[PDB]
Design a protein around this ligand. Structure first.
Ligand SMILES: Cc1sc2nc(COc3ccc(F)cc3)cc(=O)n2c1[C@@H]1C[C@H]1CO
Ligand SMILES: N[C@@H](CCC(=O)O)C(=O)O
Lengths: 279, 280
């Protein structure tokens, strides 16, 4: 029983989604097959699996795992939410797919946190992450404890900052800074791309989000204008981890293989391949 | 019941001082006016290799001791701390059999129930023990006496050595495991195995006494040492990145709650508080 149902989610450069070849109708080069359930309409539950192609840093990690740990897989893209949120005590997203046994594992830009760890097991971290703050170069903010964030209405006009809600970053803010949280929600960004445009055009002063993605975005920013505060400072340091079901038989070999890739330089090679930038 | 904790001397994660005449620990305070939490930690004094080890109560404090106290309060366990008898972190050495030394050996033999130290998570050790999620991410860097001009890991004095420029690490440590395992570093490993030190403190001292030209070790330790001893500096950034975790036997009934508590401490800023108090 080594053919594994695996869930993922697009988030460049960790997981990038492409249309399947026009001539071949197959996935070529550094890509793997990944399916996405797409609804026929909104008056039906009927839908179809669209054959897509997946690549990126987490996909090269999956390719290495599949080969070392000796398993084959049916990779699919989550459609019920994103990374993972507990809604009315029910987990949706990649976490939910694992919790409710639709996937043996979740591979992607998935943040290890305490509440997720109570319902799934996480492998060893394969990428360092946590929370970073993106700003226009030279913006004077000390960190998450800056009074501009903690007590925003103590400033005229108040500092404008948001996150992409429903992920590990919003959860942390909610749990740690209740005033900052309720204030920020009017600045909720639909995604990273909307947030970068809002920052670049002066509609937002700071963007609080996943450190690994923000470091990537800063390194590729046109004109190197958008930066992370501090020397790429990280609050509540954590990592991306592979989510597995509680008591998973696969965890042991996945942890050892990941640590093997770390020690070998294989992990450093993927970082050079997918995560380095000009800034 | 009462967990046996093993640790190692390693500033600034674990400071080790003699007790006062009455067997208590000197009352100290941070510049922040807060009391320094100290624990009695038994261990040998005469560190001479191949010599008898006379165990005496000593005083233990630091990043890892504050971390132990938090874990013990959260999970509601009592404990007793001792310093690793051979003064080593731990490697698997060939005897037909293979054996773990240092804290690794003590954990596997039952002399300790938990390792609470700057213990590097690597494949070799994870094969035999349970590591918690990391409490610190750091890496490897090189320590030199100010005025020594090395570029880093790719310097010709390191890659193509001679007895003119002596470089080393700590014996029976994860850094030793790292250089031995990676064939690309065998030239370095062969030079290092002729000059490796018993402890990080002896190696840091040897760099000061111009007896060691470069010390390859943990950045969390070397950067703290550079910031305190202005005559020593690190060269370059990190050439490898590694994390520290809590060590337990694979059967430990504390392993899930240890990781959950470490995640809780990272998420609520407790771990960052410890970093500010002891490191930055
Ligand atoms: C590779 C990476 S990336 C990476 N990032 C971190 C950063 O800190 C944490 C802390 C808690 C957590 F839940 C996840 C990460 C630690 C670490 O050790 N690593 C690692 C080595 C391999 C893993 C060993 O634990
Ligand atoms: N990586 C995050 C998503 C982005 C964020 O919330 O920072 C997660 O797994 O929830």
């Amino acid at each position: 029983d080594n053919h594994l149902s695996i869930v993922t989610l697009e988030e460049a450069p960790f997981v990038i989604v492409e249309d399947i070849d026009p001539l071949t109708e197959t996935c070529v080069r550094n890509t793997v097959p990944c399916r996405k359930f797409v609804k026929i309409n909104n008056s039906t539950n009927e839908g179809m699996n669209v054959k897509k192609c997946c690549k990126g840093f987490c996909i090269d990690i999956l390719k290495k795992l599949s080969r070392t740990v000796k398993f084959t897989y049916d990779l699919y893209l989550v459609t019920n939410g994103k990374h993972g949120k507990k809604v009315n005590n029910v987990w949706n997203g990649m976490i939910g797919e694992v919790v409710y046994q639709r996937a043996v594992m979740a591979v992607g830009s998935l943040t290890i946190n305490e509440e997720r760890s109570e319902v799934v097991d996480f492998s060893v971290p394969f990428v360092e992450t946590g929370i970073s703050v993106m700003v226009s170069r030279g913006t004077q903010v000390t960190g998450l404890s800056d009074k501009k964030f903690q007590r925003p209405h103590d400033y005229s006009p108040p500092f404008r900052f948001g996150t992409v809600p429903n992920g590990s970053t919003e959860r942390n803010i909610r749990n740690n800074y209740p005033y900052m949280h309720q204030y920020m929600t009017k600045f909720n960004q639909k995604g990273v791309e909307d947030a970068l445009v809002s920052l670049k055009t002066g509609k937002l002063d700071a963007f609080i989000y996943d450190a690994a993605v923000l470091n990537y975005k800063a390194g590729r920013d046109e004109g190197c204008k958008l930066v992370t505060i501090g020397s790429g400072y990280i609050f509540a340091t954590t990592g991306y981890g592979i989510a597995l079901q509680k008591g998973s038989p696969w965890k042991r070999q996945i942890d050892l293989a990941l640590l093997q890739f770390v020690g070998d330089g294989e992990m450093e090679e993927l970082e050079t391949l997918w995560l380095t930038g000009i800034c | 019941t009462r967990l046996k904790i093993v640790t190692i001397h390693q500033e600034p994660f674990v400071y080790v001082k003699p007790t006062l005449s009455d067997g208590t620990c000197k009352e100290e305070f941070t510049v922040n006016g807060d009391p320094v939490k100290k624990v009695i930690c038994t261990g040998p004094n005469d560190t001479s290799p191949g010599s008898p080890r006379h165990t005496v109560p000593q005083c233990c404090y630091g990043f890892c001791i504050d971390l132990l106290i938090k874990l013990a309060r959260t999970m509601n366990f009592t404990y007793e701390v001792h310093l690793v008898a051979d003064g080593k972190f731990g490697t698997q050495e060939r005897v037909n059999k293979k054996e773990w030394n240092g804290m690794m050996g003590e954990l596997l033999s039952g002399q300790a129930d938990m390792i609470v130290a700057p213990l590097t998570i690597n494949n070799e050790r994870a094969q035999y023990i349970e590591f918690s999620k990391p409490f610190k991410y750091q890496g490897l860097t090189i320590l030199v006496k100010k005025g020594t001009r090395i570029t880093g890991i790719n310097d010709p004095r390191l890659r193509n050595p001679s007895d003119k420029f002596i470089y080393a690490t700590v014996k029976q440590s994860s850094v030793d495991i790292y250089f031995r395992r990676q064939v690309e570093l065998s030239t370095m490993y062969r030079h290092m195995e002729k000059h490796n030190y018993e402890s990080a403190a002896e190696a840091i001292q040897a760099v000061r006494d111009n007896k060691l030209h470069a010390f390859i070790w943990d950045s969390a330790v070397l950067e703290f040492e550079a910031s305190q001893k202005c005559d020593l500096v690190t060269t370059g950034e990190l050439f490898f990145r590694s994390g520290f975790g809590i060590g337990m036997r694979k059967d430990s009934p504390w392993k899930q709650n240890v990781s959950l508590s470490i995640l809780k401490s990272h998420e609520n800023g407790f771990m960052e508080d410890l970093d500010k108090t002891w490191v930055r």
